[PDB]
Amino acid sequence: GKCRGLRTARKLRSHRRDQKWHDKQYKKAHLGTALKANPFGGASHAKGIVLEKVGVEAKQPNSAIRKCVRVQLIKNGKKITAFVPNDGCLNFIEENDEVLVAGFGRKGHAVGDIPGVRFKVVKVANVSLLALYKGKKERPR
Amino acid sequence: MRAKWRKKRMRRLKRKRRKMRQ
Amino acid sequence: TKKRRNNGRAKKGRGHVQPIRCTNCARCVPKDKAIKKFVIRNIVEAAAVRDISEASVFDAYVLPKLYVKLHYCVSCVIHSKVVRNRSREARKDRTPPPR
Amino acid sequence: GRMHAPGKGLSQSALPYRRSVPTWLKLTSDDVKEQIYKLAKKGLTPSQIGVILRDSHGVAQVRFVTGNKILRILKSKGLAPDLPEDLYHLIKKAVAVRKHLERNRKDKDAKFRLILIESRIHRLARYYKTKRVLPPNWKYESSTASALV
Amino acid sequence: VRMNVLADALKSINNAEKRGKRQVLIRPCSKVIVRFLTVMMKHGYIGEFEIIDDHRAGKIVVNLTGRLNKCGVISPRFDVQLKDLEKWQNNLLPSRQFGFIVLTTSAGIMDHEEARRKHTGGKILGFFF
Amino acid sequence: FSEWIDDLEADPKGKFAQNLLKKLTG
RNA sequence: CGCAAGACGGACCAGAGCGAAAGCAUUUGCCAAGAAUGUUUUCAUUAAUCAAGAACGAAAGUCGGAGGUUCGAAGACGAUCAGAUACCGUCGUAGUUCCGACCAUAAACGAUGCCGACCGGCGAUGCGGCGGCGUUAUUCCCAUGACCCGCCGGGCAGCUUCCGGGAAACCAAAGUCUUUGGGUUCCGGGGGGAGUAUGGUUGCAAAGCUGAAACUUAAAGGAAUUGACGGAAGGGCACCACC
RNA sequence: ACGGGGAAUCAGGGUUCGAUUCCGGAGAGGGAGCCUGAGAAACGGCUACCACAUCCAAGGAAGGCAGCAGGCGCGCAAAUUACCCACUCCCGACCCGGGGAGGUAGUGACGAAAAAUAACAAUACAGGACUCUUUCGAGGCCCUGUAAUUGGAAUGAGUCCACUUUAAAUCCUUUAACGAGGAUCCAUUGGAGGGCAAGUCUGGUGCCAGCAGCCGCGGUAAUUCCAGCUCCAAUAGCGUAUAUUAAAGUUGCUGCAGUUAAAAAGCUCGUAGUUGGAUCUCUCUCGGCCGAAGCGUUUACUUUGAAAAAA
């Protein structure tokens, strides 16, 4: 059992502090390896340059080709795969253009069928993918 | 796989690595 | 999950029980876990008893018996039908079969 | 339970409610003191003295006839041993175990029991040192122990 | 070994009350145990009890009236100020209409209501309801 | 009314299963 | 019919005993321990659990020495098989044995830390103690042995129970837990990566202790239920089964 | 990782944040050394070196925006090279001068507060019911909705005067003029299988395109893609990513677990650590109905009092 003594404050606090390191979220948020291995470097978004268009095959139960792009981040030169969300939206992207990329919503985790893809394209050429999708804006010339 | 044979494979790997790094 | 409260043995109050060799397969089985049979059988069969008693030079010689101790392992004891599987409730029963 | 054994024995003396000298006992307090002095001069420890006072002289409890405990009586008269009886007996047992172990060096059980006995010796010595019965410099050694016995 | 003889006493009372027994034997007794039992009695939770005097430490035969739901000890004896008394009441008592937290204060051993009346904190010994 | 009850009993674990079970009462 | 060697102590042998655990079974002697019981003996809080540290620690394995019966990793053959680098068989090295020095690991298990209190019943059994009809032995008296009937104290367990608990299996503890606090140590935080890499430490080695991260993943898993299946057992039926 | 006051969250306990206007510290590209002075190891002072960099007639000279604006660069990420000493205060020799301190405007969907996008009548229409016979029907006697029906009333968004504001100003407030029937002066952002409120309606596609935080939807009748219609959620706002808090009694002090789900060290001993059985119910002096110097062994605890920056 646990120690219940008026002078056990140090032991209880030390035990709590050591046992917190066995929590995956606490260890992730307090070690620095996750922060240093995060391609965004702790940011919410990052700008990158599209290196090529790729088609990632959905996981085994489903069957589709998710259109993604290989982008190299300007901040650190790291290469990542960013999903191009909507349909026909890969047509809005051209090679070697600047894209603003956010996370996929699961904090470094793959989302849905797309295996190993944790980023999604938010902007291409300083215009949001949603504005191009609905015809609100057109690609800069 | 039987866990003890996985342990045996790991130990043989460690011996091979020890031979690697003398 | 636990099938038996005694773990299929009688090792209560000790740490180690000396092993014995199965009479059938020679497998090493703890002496308290092995299934023990004591067979006291007439040294001549019930068929040969008539000829042997008729040919005896004595009158009422009474043939000697044969006292054999068999220590089956669980696999061999189950295969030889010396013991068999029982229902979860009937497993707890410890009275020997009436025979 | 036991300090160094898994036993949980309950056997012990059960003292009666009354704290008075029994009716059968005609011995006065000074007579009991003189008997205690003679027994101590004979070379008997307070446990032994109480045993033979209870067993042959009808003295159920010396404290209820004299008003003092046997060890205190011996200290007051001045013929009490240098070190206490229980510690002396523990040291004697440890010396005996060590003497056995020198001629029987493969007895791991003897080594385990000697460790237990020496732990008991150290606990008793620490207690007696806090109570100032033993000098603060008193220490138990593996060589001078037989001298104290 | 045995520590907190009050804990053992209250555990014995609780286990006897769960079993429906009319009496419980508490041993060893103590001043704290007797004061706690008296505080229990003035509120009508246990009724009369008797102290058997053996010449080493007392025993107590407590008659049990089946009015007791839970008697418990709070170990360690946390020091409680008047401000924290409401939090302790919320934590330990089933309702604000009944149930008492027993504290040892410099004015003696008493329930939390009497501690508020005397305007004193103390160390929490236990609770009963 | 009983339409949801009846279409549920046709396919208890079909596509229209959570919908109909919720539509019964929620 | 003998002789020699080494190994091992059958049956008795038990849900019996002892030991901290590992473990412990021919006789006799010596040696030092030990629990429990008994105690109107003694001390008088001397205690519980414990970082550090220390003793012991199956088997296998590692160094030297002795021995070397059996069995036997490896190995050599012979079989079986589509193939067998296995299962089976004949040999057979290390080892298995003892001595000294290492190693410190096991499903080292009750998969259940230790100390303390309370909470049902019953019949057994081991040790000690107490009481008592009666039987039997020491030729006859008490004592004492062997039984018989009870009681008490610790112990290995068992059965039973709507104590209570629990996801249940089950557990008189795994109960006295939202009516949550007796004391204390160790230790877990979804599954893998992985007890891995790395550093440190220990070891002659084999390895032991400490011990991640990147990455990956929606489940792994526990108990129980219904089916289906089984080269599992037991029953029953049928000339599309047999006699 | 500047610290604190403090902030977010929070049943109780807690968890996280605090560069950031107030207090304290530190620094002025990095180091170091000084002058002056009451006060500086000052940098909108000097002296060097190190890095970077400006002008040069090549001999030399001159640097320090982590002040206010404004550039570059970096990035997901942050505004004007504006006006004024009128306020608040500060400095000076000074009622008078000066202050990018500070104030005022500009940009501003960081956030927070209030708050429009219609209201009311008649007309019939889908209309109900304590209106009534007898359920059948009359339905201006008690209220919604078809509205490309009708009708006048109201008003501010806007434009524009005059004040007022203020150091000129702007804004708000006030006054007048014009200003509303698709009142086209036209509300959006996400969704409609479950979680989770709202369609197994229609067309298209056909494991494709895609959707989908999760479970899953899609392979010719898709309640889930792409659309149209309709519907609901919040609303001048709403979605997304990341971080964080509650949810998490999934860090458990309150308050978790450890037979089999993850887990008690193989086993004892043992120091520190933690924990530890009963017991014990106010006196010498001074100015005659007072006043006290105290050592009663202290500590924890509890209660009171003092002191404790505002925000």
Curated annotation (Swiss-Prot), chain B:
UniProt GO cellular component terms: cytoplasm; cytosol; cytosolic large ribosomal subunit; endoplasmic reticulum
Subcellular location: Cytoplasm
Region (Disordered) residue spans: 1-22
Listed InterPro entries: Ribosomal_eS32 (IPR007836)
Keywords: Cytoplasm, Ribonucleoprotein, Ribosomal protein
Source organism superkingdom: Eukaryota
GO molecular function: mRNA 3'-UTR binding; mRNA 5'-UTR binding; RNA binding; structural constituent of ribosome
Pfam families: Ribosomal_L41
One of the GO biological process terms: cytoplasmic translation
Residue ranges of coiled coil: none
Homology family: Belongs to the eukaryotic ribosomal protein eS32 family.
Function comment: Component of the small ribosomal subunit. The ribosome is a large ribonucleoprotein complex responsible for the synthesis of proteins in the cell. Interacts with the beta subunit of protein kinase CKII and stimulates phosphorylation of DNA topoisomerase II alpha by CKII.
UniProt subunit comment: Component of the small ribosomal subunit.
Note: Initially thought to be part of the large ribosomal subunit. Crystal structures show eS32/eL41 to be a small ribosomal subunit forming a bridge at the interface of the 2 subunits.
Protein name: Small ribosomal subunit protein eS32
From Swiss-Prot, chain C:
A GO cellular-component term linked to this record: small ribosomal subunit
An annotated Gene Ontology molecular function: mRNA binding
Domain of life: Eukaryota
The keyword NADP is assigned to this record: no
Modified sites of kind Phosphoserine: S53
Main location: cytoplasm
Gene3D superfamilies registered for this protein in UniProt: Ribosomal protein S26e
Subcellular location: Cytoplasm, Cytosol; Cytoplasm; Rough endoplasmic reticulum
Keywords: Cytoplasm, Diamond-Blackfan anemia, Disease variant, Endoplasmic reticulum, Phosphoprotein, Ribonucleoprotein, Ribosomal protein
Record field: compositional bias (Basic and acidic residues): 86-96
PROSITE patterns with a match to the protein in the record: RIBOSOMAL_S26E
Pfam families: Ribosomal_S26e
GO biological process: cytoplasmic translation; negative regulation of RNA splicing; translation
InterPro entries: Ribosomal_eS26 (IPR000892), Ribosomal_eS26_CS (IPR047864), Ribosomal_eS26_sf (IPR038551)
Family: Belongs to the eukaryotic ribosomal protein eS26 family.
Disease tied to this entry: Diamond-Blackfan anemia 10: A form of Diamond-Blackfan anemia, a congenital non-regenerative hypoplastic anemia that usually presents early in infancy. Diamond-Blackfan anemia is characterized by a moderate to severe macrocytic anemia, erythroblastopenia, and an increased risk of malignancy. 30 to 40% of Diamond-Blackfan anemia patients present with short stature and congenital anomalies, the most frequent being craniofacial (Pierre-Robin syndrome and cleft palate), thumb and urogenital anomalies.
Function as written in the Swiss-Prot or TrEMBL entry: Component of the small ribosomal subunit. The ribosome is a large ribonucleoprotein complex responsible for the synthesis of proteins in the cell.
Subunit record text: Component of the 40S small ribosomal subunit.
Protein's name according to its UniProt entry: Small ribosomal subunit protein eS26
UniProtKB/Swiss-Prot annotation, chain D:
Protein localization: Cytoplasm; Nucleus, Nucleolus
UniProt keyword list: Acetylation, Cytoplasm, Isopeptide bond, Nucleus, Phosphoprotein, Ribonucleoprotein, Ribosomal protein, Ubl conjugation
GO terms (BP aspect): cytoplasmic translation; negative regulation of RNA splicing; ribosomal small subunit biogenesis; translation
Modified residues (N6-acetyllysine): K26
Keyword Acetylation: yes
Modification Phosphoserine occurs at: S29
Role played: Component of the small ribosomal subunit. The ribosome is a large ribonucleoprotein complex responsible for the synthesis of proteins in the cell. Part of the small subunit (SSU) processome, first precursor of the small eukaryotic ribosomal subunit. During the assembly of the SSU processome in the nucleolus, many ribosome biogenesis factors, an RNA chaperone and ribosomal proteins associate with the nascent pre-rRNA and work in concert to generate RNA folding, modifications, rearrangements and cleavage as well as targeted degradation of pre-ribosomal RNA by the RNA exosome.
Assembly and interaction partners: Component of the small ribosomal subunit. Part of the small subunit (SSU) processome, composed of more than 70 proteins and the RNA chaperone small nucleolar RNA (snoRNA) U3.
Annotated HAMAP family: Ribosomal_uS15_A
Protein's name in the database: Small ribosomal subunit protein uS15
Protein source organism: Homo sapiens
Annotated gene: RPS13
Swiss-Prot record, chain E:
PROSITE patterns reported for this sequence: RIBOSOMAL_S8
Keyword match Transmembrane helix: no
MF annotations from Gene Ontology: RNA binding; structural constituent of ribosome
Superkingdom assignment: Eukaryota
Cellular location(s): Cytoplasm; Nucleus, Nucleolus
Coiled coil (UniProt feature): none
Main location: cytoplasm
Location of N6-succinyllysine modifications: K87
One GO CC annotation: membrane
Pfam families: Ribosomal_S8
GO annotation, biological process: cytoplasmic translation; positive regulation of cell cycle; positive regulation of cell population proliferation; response to virus; ribosomal small subunit biogenesis; translation
Keyword line: Cytoplasm, Diamond-Blackfan anemia, Nucleus, Ribonucleoprotein, Ribosomal protein
Record's subunit section: Component of the 40S ribosomal subunit. Part of the small subunit (SSU) processome, composed of more than 70 proteins and the RNA chaperone small nucleolar RNA (snoRNA) U3.
UniProt similarity note: Belongs to the universal ribosomal protein uS8 family.
PANTHER family: 40S RIBOSOMAL PROTEIN S15A
Clinical disorder: Diamond-Blackfan anemia 20: A form of Diamond-Blackfan anemia, a congenital non-regenerative hypoplastic anemia that usually presents early in infancy. Diamond-Blackfan anemia is characterized by a moderate to severe macrocytic anemia, erythroblastopenia, and an increased risk of malignancy. 30 to 40% of Diamond-Blackfan anemia patients present with short stature and congenital anomalies, the most frequent being craniofacial (Pierre-Robin syndrome and cleft palate), thumb and urogenital anomalies. DBA20 inheritance is autosomal dominant.
Name of the molecule in the record: Small ribosomal subunit protein uS8
UniProt source species: Homo sapiens
